[PDB]
Ligand binder design. Sequence first.
Ligand SMILES: [Mg+2]
Ligand SMILES: [Mg+2]
Ligand SMILES: [Mg+2]
Ligand SMILES: [Mg+2]
Ligand SMILES: [Mg+2]
Ligand SMILES: [Mg+2]
Ligand SMILES: [Mg+2]
Ligand SMILES: [Mg+2]
Ligand SMILES: [Mg+2]
Ligand SMILES: [Mg+2]
Ligand SMILES: [Mg+2]
Ligand SMILES: [Mg+2]
Ligand SMILES: [Mg+2]
Ligand SMILES: [Mg+2]
Ligand SMILES: [Mg+2]
Ligand SMILES: [Mg+2]
Ligand SMILES: [Mg+2]
Ligand SMILES: [Mg+2]
Ligand SMILES: [Mg+2]
Ligand SMILES: [Mg+2]
Ligand SMILES: [Mg+2]
Ligand SMILES: [Mg+2]
Ligand SMILES: [Mg+2]
Ligand SMILES: [Mg+2]
Ligand SMILES: [Mg+2]
Ligand SMILES: [Mg+2]
Ligand SMILES: [Mg+2]
Ligand SMILES: [Mg+2]
Ligand SMILES: [Mg+2]
Ligand SMILES: [Mg+2]
Ligand SMILES: [Mg+2]
Ligand SMILES: [Mg+2]
Ligand SMILES: [Mg+2]
Ligand SMILES: [Mg+2]
Ligand SMILES: [Mg+2]
Ligand SMILES: [Mg+2]
Ligand SMILES: [Mg+2]
Ligand SMILES: [Mg+2]
Ligand SMILES: [Mg+2]
Ligand SMILES: [Mg+2]
Ligand SMILES: [Mg+2]
Ligand SMILES: [Mg+2]
Ligand SMILES: [Mg+2]
Ligand SMILES: [Mg+2]
Ligand SMILES: [Mg+2]
Ligand SMILES: [Mg+2]
Ligand SMILES: [Mg+2]
Ligand SMILES: [Mg+2]
Ligand SMILES: [Mg+2]
Ligand SMILES: [Mg+2]
Ligand SMILES: [Mg+2]
Ligand SMILES: [Mg+2]
Ligand SMILES: [Mg+2]
Ligand SMILES: [Mg+2]
Ligand SMILES: [Mg+2]
Ligand SMILES: [Mg+2]
Ligand SMILES: [Mg+2]
Ligand SMILES: [Mg+2]
Ligand SMILES: [Mg+2]
Ligand SMILES: [Mg+2]
Ligand SMILES: [Mg+2]
Ligand SMILES: [Mg+2]
Ligand SMILES: [Mg+2]
Ligand SMILES: [Mg+2]
Ligand SMILES: [Mg+2]
Ligand SMILES: [Mg+2]
Ligand SMILES: [Mg+2]
Ligand SMILES: [Mg+2]
Ligand SMILES: [Mg+2]
Ligand SMILES: [Mg+2]
Ligand SMILES: [Mg+2]
Ligand SMILES: [Mg+2]
Ligand SMILES: [Mg+2]
Ligand SMILES: [Mg+2]
Ligand SMILES: [Mg+2]
Ligand SMILES: [Mg+2]
Ligand SMILES: [Mg+2]
Ligand SMILES: [Mg+2]
Ligand SMILES: [Mg+2]
Ligand SMILES: [Mg+2]
Ligand SMILES: [Mg+2]
Ligand SMILES: [Mg+2]
Ligand SMILES: [Mg+2]
Ligand SMILES: [Mg+2]
Ligand SMILES: [Mg+2]
Ligand SMILES: [Mg+2]
Ligand SMILES: [Mg+2]
Ligand SMILES: [Mg+2]
Ligand SMILES: [Mg+2]
Ligand SMILES: [Mg+2]
Ligand SMILES: [Mg+2]
Ligand SMILES: [Mg+2]
Ligand SMILES: [Mg+2]
Ligand SMILES: [Mg+2]
Ligand SMILES: [Mg+2]
Ligand SMILES: [Mg+2]
Ligand SMILES: [Mg+2]
Ligand SMILES: [Mg+2]
Ligand SMILES: [Mg+2]
Ligand SMILES: [Mg+2]
Ligand SMILES: [Mg+2]
Ligand SMILES: [Mg+2]
Ligand SMILES: [Mg+2]
Ligand SMILES: [Zn+2]
Lengths: 50, 60, 91, 252, 112, 77, 63
Amino acid sequence: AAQKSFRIKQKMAKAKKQNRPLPQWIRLRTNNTIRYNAKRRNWRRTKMNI
Amino acid sequence: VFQVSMKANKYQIKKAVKELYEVDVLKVNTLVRPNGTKKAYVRLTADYDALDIANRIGYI
Amino acid sequence: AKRTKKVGITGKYGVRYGSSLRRQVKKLEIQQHARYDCSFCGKKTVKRGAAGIWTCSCCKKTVAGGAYTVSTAAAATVRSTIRRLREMVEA
Amino acid sequence: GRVIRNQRKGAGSIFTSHTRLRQGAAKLRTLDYAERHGYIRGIVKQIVHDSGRGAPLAKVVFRDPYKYRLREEIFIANEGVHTGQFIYAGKKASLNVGNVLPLGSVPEGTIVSNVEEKPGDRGALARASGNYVIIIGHNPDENKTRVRLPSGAKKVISSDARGVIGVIAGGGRVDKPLLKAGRAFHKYRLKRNSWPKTRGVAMNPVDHPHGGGNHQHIGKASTISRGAVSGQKAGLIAARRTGLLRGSQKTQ
Amino acid sequence: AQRVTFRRRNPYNTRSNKIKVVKTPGGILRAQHVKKLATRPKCGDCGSALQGISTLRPRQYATVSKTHKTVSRAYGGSRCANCVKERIIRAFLIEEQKIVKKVVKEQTEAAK
Amino acid sequence: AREITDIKQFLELTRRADVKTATVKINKKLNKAGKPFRQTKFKVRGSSSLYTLVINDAGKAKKLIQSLPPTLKVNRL
Amino acid sequence: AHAQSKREGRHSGYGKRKGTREARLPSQVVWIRRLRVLRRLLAKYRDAGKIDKHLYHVLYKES
RNA sequence: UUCAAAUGAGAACUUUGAAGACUGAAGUGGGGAAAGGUUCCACGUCAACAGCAGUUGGACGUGGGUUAGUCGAUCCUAAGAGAUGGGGAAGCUCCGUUUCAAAGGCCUGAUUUUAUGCAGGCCACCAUCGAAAGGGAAUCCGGUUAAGAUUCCGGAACCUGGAUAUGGAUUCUUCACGGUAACGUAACUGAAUGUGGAGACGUCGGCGCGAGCCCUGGGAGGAGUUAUCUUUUCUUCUUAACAGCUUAUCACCCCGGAAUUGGUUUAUCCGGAGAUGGGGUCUUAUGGCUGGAAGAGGCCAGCACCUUUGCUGGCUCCGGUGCGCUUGUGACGGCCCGUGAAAAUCCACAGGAAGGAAUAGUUUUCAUGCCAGGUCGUACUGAUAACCGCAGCAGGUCUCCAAGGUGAACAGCCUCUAGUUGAUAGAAUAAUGUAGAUAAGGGAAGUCGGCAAAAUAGAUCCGUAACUUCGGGAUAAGGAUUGGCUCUAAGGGUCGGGUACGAUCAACUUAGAACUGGUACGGACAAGGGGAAUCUGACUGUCUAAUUAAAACAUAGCAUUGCGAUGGUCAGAAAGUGAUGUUGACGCAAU
RNA sequence: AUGGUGAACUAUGCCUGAAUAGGGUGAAGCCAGAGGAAACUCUGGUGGAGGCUCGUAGCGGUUCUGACGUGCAAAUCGAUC
Ligand SMILES: [Mg+2]
Ligand SMILES: [Mg+2]
Ligand SMILES: [Mg+2]
Ligand SMILES: [Mg+2]
Ligand SMILES: [Mg+2]
Ligand SMILES: [Mg+2]
Ligand SMILES: [Mg+2]
Ligand SMILES: [Mg+2]
Ligand SMILES: [Mg+2]
Ligand SMILES: [Mg+2]
Ligand SMILES: [Mg+2]
Ligand SMILES: [Mg+2]
Ligand SMILES: [Mg+2]
Ligand SMILES: [Mg+2]
Ligand SMILES: [Mg+2]
Ligand SMILES: [Mg+2]
Ligand SMILES: [Mg+2]
Ligand SMILES: [Mg+2]
Ligand SMILES: [Mg+2]
Ligand SMILES: [Mg+2]
Ligand SMILES: [Mg+2]
Ligand SMILES: [Mg+2]
Ligand SMILES: [Mg+2]
Ligand SMILES: [Mg+2]
Ligand SMILES: [Mg+2]
Ligand SMILES: [Mg+2]
Ligand SMILES: [Mg+2]
Ligand SMILES: [Mg+2]
Ligand SMILES: [Mg+2]
Ligand SMILES: [Mg+2]
Ligand SMILES: [Mg+2]
Ligand SMILES: [Mg+2]
Ligand SMILES: [Mg+2]
Ligand SMILES: [Mg+2]
Ligand SMILES: [Mg+2]
Ligand SMILES: [Mg+2]
Ligand SMILES: [Mg+2]
Ligand SMILES: [Mg+2]
Ligand SMILES: [Mg+2]
Ligand SMILES: [Mg+2]
Ligand SMILES: [Mg+2]
Ligand SMILES: [Mg+2]
Ligand SMILES: [Mg+2]
Ligand SMILES: [Mg+2]
Ligand SMILES: [Mg+2]
Ligand SMILES: [Mg+2]
Ligand SMILES: [Mg+2]
Ligand SMILES: [Mg+2]
Ligand SMILES: [Mg+2]
Ligand SMILES: [Mg+2]
Ligand SMILES: [Mg+2]
Ligand SMILES: [Mg+2]
Ligand SMILES: [Mg+2]
Ligand SMILES: [Mg+2]
Ligand SMILES: [Mg+2]
Ligand SMILES: [Mg+2]
Ligand SMILES: [Mg+2]
Ligand SMILES: [Mg+2]
Ligand SMILES: [Mg+2]
Ligand SMILES: [Mg+2]
Ligand SMILES: [Mg+2]
Ligand SMILES: [Mg+2]
Ligand SMILES: [Mg+2]
Ligand SMILES: [Mg+2]
Ligand SMILES: [Mg+2]
Ligand SMILES: [Mg+2]
Ligand SMILES: [Mg+2]
Ligand SMILES: [Mg+2]
Ligand SMILES: [Mg+2]
Ligand SMILES: [Mg+2]
Ligand SMILES: [Mg+2]
Ligand SMILES: [Mg+2]
Ligand SMILES: [Mg+2]
Ligand SMILES: [Mg+2]
Ligand SMILES: [Mg+2]
Ligand SMILES: [Mg+2]
Ligand SMILES: [Mg+2]
Ligand SMILES: [Mg+2]
Ligand SMILES: [Mg+2]
Ligand SMILES: [Mg+2]
Ligand SMILES: [Mg+2]
Ligand SMILES: [Mg+2]
Ligand SMILES: [Mg+2]
Ligand SMILES: [Mg+2]
Ligand SMILES: [Mg+2]
Ligand SMILES: [Mg+2]
Ligand SMILES: [Mg+2]
Ligand SMILES: [Mg+2]
Ligand SMILES: [Mg+2]
Ligand SMILES: [Mg+2]
Ligand SMILES: [Mg+2]
Ligand SMILES: [Mg+2]
Ligand SMILES: [Mg+2]
Ligand SMILES: [Mg+2]
Ligand SMILES: [Mg+2]
Ligand SMILES: [Mg+2]
Ligand SMILES: [Mg+2]
Ligand SMILES: [Mg+2]
Ligand SMILES: [Mg+2]
Ligand SMILES: [Mg+2]
Ligand SMILES: [Mg+2]
Ligand SMILES: [Mg+2]
Ligand SMILES: [Mg+2]
Ligand SMILES: [Zn+2]
């Protein structure tokens, strides 16, 4: 919040990383069933509660 | 510019640079990248040319 | 020019609180803001602040007194009745 | 029903004393060797206002008879004491305003403040601005000293009990009208959250014995017995009489 | 007509956040935070701002030479030189009267 | 961050062990209400302070330039 | 241009006055000026010896 | 809101240029705190989302970006929180925080087996957590990015810790001299212990000063206007931390000995406890000159050319004014039954333990020199779209900076700088609406009721009732006047006079007089309706957030009650428990 | 009934901070002046008191029983206060 604890900054870093589309090669795997990334987050829609 | 262990402080960078690259370090500035990684801005004394020492390690 | 016929310092409260209350205050308020003679240095520089406390402008002496006047009639006689009793224990 | 106001005070959340600015605790010196065999000298280094208190305090510094150091006490300023005065404290000590003497060692008629209930409690009786106790006699065997307290009560205490000659500064403070709410506000602001007082007769019955009714009234006798129980005691507790006290007061 | 901004996160007008406006060589206005003003030291006896002594904030008195923190007479950076005049006369007179107090009550013991 | 005028003290600074580099600055200014003159500023960079000696006399300047120690790096202008 | 006309005692009638005469120029400012001007004359008139201190001291308290 | 171009399959909606407007420094500006967490920036890009559109986006896809000895945290203590010997409790756990406890650690000497056992002496201080607004070691200016900067680059400092050596100082009178004194300084040993000070403190008022802003003269440049007028209109002309010298209201010293009392503030306070006067000392807020530093930055000209993009120059100067504005600060004064934190930390003094030179010592509070300074935060938004209100919601949400005119003004109204021009659009203008207005004659007849609306209003002057707690009532009521232009008069500063005046510089205030107009003139804006009574609450104040603001609650005042601590009232399951209580009847508690 | 979770709203105390255009009124204190045989009474200034006052921001929420009443909004908007 413009002056952070490292605990909060770390979690912020992990959330950034998790925020990417489904790596499209996984779709090609044998017996693959994952169509898309069903856990995509967005700051303007769902707040991540610290 | 090096990606550096989060556990490493400004001293351990300066030392680990000299040992691994045979260079004199003037000063070391660090920051935590916004993905939980450490970035060292390592500046060499005027004797060493960074550009040369950069394609001596290989990247370019 | 005479500014007010009776309220004096008490005119700041204006019409409020009732004549009699204002009258009682005016008395003690006049009592408490006044300059008093200093026992120690013989000037009239004793003034109050913090009811009970009376200090002298120069000579920097501070005397414990009455809430709105330096000497209170009670402590006055107590002074004398102690003066009397003390003298019973030397003569 | 609800828990009534006077019951909530004992928990002491919002009712504890507003203490930040206080000067300290006013106390006679510890009743050490010097004070109970001879006397000890000090200088009132300052007389000062104690927040929330009527009477000014007197900072009086002494020498430490056992270590090389100054040790300062906090006395209540007896009227007439001043900066720079020498205060003497001891069995054998002159009967002068400001000094502290064992009740046994002053004649009758002496007028003292901050007097000890039992000897050594460093000051119990006659502390509020303007009060004092008068010694009204002695019993040398058992060395009691009969005194009269500001209430009028006549307690008898040990002759070793210590008091300070004189009366307490700041008298007459209660002769001036507060004149308006704010004065009382800033008054209790530095004492404790006792002000202002909603009448129990203006609340609903959950709140108080006096609450409710289509008119505002007590409804039963407001004299509550000593044996009453918490939440009952409100009004005139254990009143032995009631009504406008006409005729001369002044205990016989 | 040119306005200015704080230079530190603290956005309120606290006594530790005093500001001065300054014109720089760039030809523009820019704030510069001001440390709280220092006060003068005081005579422990009387209480006046005892002269001769430089006036800094307390941690700064460790970055200044001893001559700035004293005056040459006894009780230098401590008492106001009229109190010293007084605690001299008082000392001397009391020691003198103390001698007077002894031989007077010595003769008392020889005739009483 | 310090000004100097003792031309003797100056040469003593220029030969102080920590002093390795110096610099001479040439300014054109005016003389008291009228014509111009040539002010020189001898700046000696010490290990914690930059001493600078202002020699308004053009003649005193040239004589003082050769006076400089030969082993001293002296940035000109 | 308007400031010049103002300097020439213009646009200052009762119909151009919105703040009270006291708000426009305080009585005290007028007094402090005058009484400081009078206080200044008594000093120089004395320090030059034009008026002895016994007349000065009286004029001061009458000022 | 509009024109046009560019772009694109596609353009009311994107980009650019042009025009019209707005926010009007109490911002639609420039930043932060909490909260968000990548929205920041670039590139690509329109299926869903942006209640029309979309080539645009806080969307989508892909990347890049947050650099510190000095800014914060970190340290300190505040209310408070909470371990510990213990005491309760079946027990989860409750109580106590220096508390009925054998509570702990520093200086250096002893060692020359040798490393740290013991020989002294202290300290009895007794956890810890708790402030990104309190306290607090120390940094500035210029330059730089697509996006970072008091953090990078450049240059110039400063603090702290660790080392240290050379120079100066000091000593044969061992631990500096000088001044009558205030006190002076480049230095000028100082253990235990003790003591003092700084940290460290309300509020309002006028008065004095500082800074930045505002206004303005001459000049040296650039820009606009020029049918005509304007030696004109606009704009550039800057100087950081740090360093040296200097600079002060107050305070203080020396000479002196005062009624004919004197000095003196806007504000009456000072003097035989020594004034007025004359001469000195001090704090360095703050300002000045210089170093930093013109080499920077600002403004221009004159040539170079696909480029990296240069190069040569010149100028950057001297002043004026103040009930101005914002802020800072000083010496005072008003107020209190209110008298307006704490600790860390730093210094000084008192003390004299000790150690210390003549054939050579003591000195690191003087100068200079050496090394080092970690860990985490650092992007952006901060709101009619980055927070909370299911949302890009007309709501809510702490704060700094703050130009010109009109005017009493941070009002309203217009402007400069900066930022916007965001809110589906087109055509009509029926009824009925919502919001803004006007109406002949009457004038509350309307209505539960003047609800709504209207009338009033600034300022100067005149005038002003009952009644009253003498303070008020009172802007009572009721009147007159108010533009423009051209004049008159009054109100100041500064410098020489042997031990009456002259000379010159700079300010809008107030009054009076002429002239003048379709009788208008607080010309927009701004801005009280008044009076006579009854009921009721004394008053200012408080409440039913979201149908009740009142006569209800409160209050001062009045009166009653309890209590002397082995106590009153009150809390708890209990207790070596707790509130009042840092208390003591001028008190606390209860009506 | 039992065992639990809340003072991000709000109520109240405490700690530590911060904030509030411009006007009207003219209380004590003070200086000079006038009258009177006396007691004493007057006048003009100065000063700048107040849970004083007109009135913004602020805090409130009186009336239109105005807008809205499948809202901008589960309490808002305008005017007035
Ligand atoms: Mg949600
Ligand atoms: Mg959750
Ligand atoms: Mg960092
Ligand atoms: Mg119950
Ligand atoms: Mg307590
Ligand atoms: Mg209360
Ligand atoms: Mg009540
Ligand atoms: Mg009551
Ligand atoms: Mg009720
Ligand atoms: Mg009941
Ligand atoms: Mg009952
Ligand atoms: Mg009832
Ligand atoms: Mg009743
Ligand atoms: Mg910032
Ligand atoms: Mg000194
Ligand atoms: Mg000095
Ligand atoms: Mg006045
Ligand atoms: Mg003058
Ligand atoms: Mg006089
Ligand atoms: Mg449009
Ligand atoms: Mg456009
Ligand atoms: Mg506009
Ligand atoms: Mg405005
Ligand atoms: Mg920002
Ligand atoms: Mg793009
Ligand atoms: Mg599409
Ligand atoms: Mg969206
Ligand atoms: Mg759409
Ligand atoms: Mg679409
Ligand atoms: Mg993206
Ligand atoms: Mg990305
Ligand atoms: Mg810091
Ligand atoms: Mg740390
Ligand atoms: Mg516990
Ligand atoms: Mg802590
Ligand atoms: Mg802090
Ligand atoms: Mg702080
Ligand atoms: Mg910059
Ligand atoms: Mg960069
Ligand atoms: Mg930025
Ligand atoms: Mg740098
Ligand atoms: Mg350098
Ligand atoms: Mg050092
Ligand atoms: Mg010397
Ligand atoms: Mg200390
Ligand atoms: Mg202190
Ligand atoms: Mg403080
Ligand atoms: Mg600085
Ligand atoms: Mg003098
Ligand atoms: Mg002298
Ligand atoms: Mg001097
Ligand atoms: Mg003035
Ligand atoms: Mg302010
Ligand atoms: Mg005070
Ligand atoms: Mg000090
Ligand atoms: Mg040193
Ligand atoms: Mg360490
Ligand atoms: Mg930033
Ligand atoms: Mg936005
Ligand atoms: Mg949200
Ligand atoms: Mg919104
Ligand atoms: Mg301008
Ligand atoms: Mg913006
Ligand atoms: Mg819309
Ligand atoms: Mg529209
Ligand atoms: Mg339409
Ligand atoms: Mg219509
Ligand atoms: Mg019409
Ligand atoms: Mg009509
Ligand atoms: Mg009519
Ligand atoms: Mg009628
Ligand atoms: Mg009718
Ligand atoms: Mg009716
Ligand atoms: Mg009517
Ligand atoms: Mg109406
Ligand atoms: Mg009309
Ligand atoms: Mg009337
Ligand atoms: Mg006219
Ligand atoms: Mg004139
Ligand atoms: Mg003239
Ligand atoms: Mg009416
Ligand atoms: Mg009422
Ligand atoms: Mg309601
Ligand atoms: Mg309800
Ligand atoms: Mg109301
Ligand atoms: Mg209501
Ligand atoms: Mg009554
Ligand atoms: Mg027990
Ligand atoms: Mg809360
Ligand atoms: Mg404040
Ligand atoms: Mg007005
Ligand atoms: Mg006002
Ligand atoms: Mg006469
Ligand atoms: Mg006033
Ligand atoms: Mg008011
Ligand atoms: Mg009002
Ligand atoms: Mg107004
Ligand atoms: Mg309110
Ligand atoms: Mg409002
Ligand atoms: Mg409303
Ligand atoms: Mg309605
Ligand atoms: Mg409808
Ligand atoms: Mg209003
Ligand atoms: Zn005195």
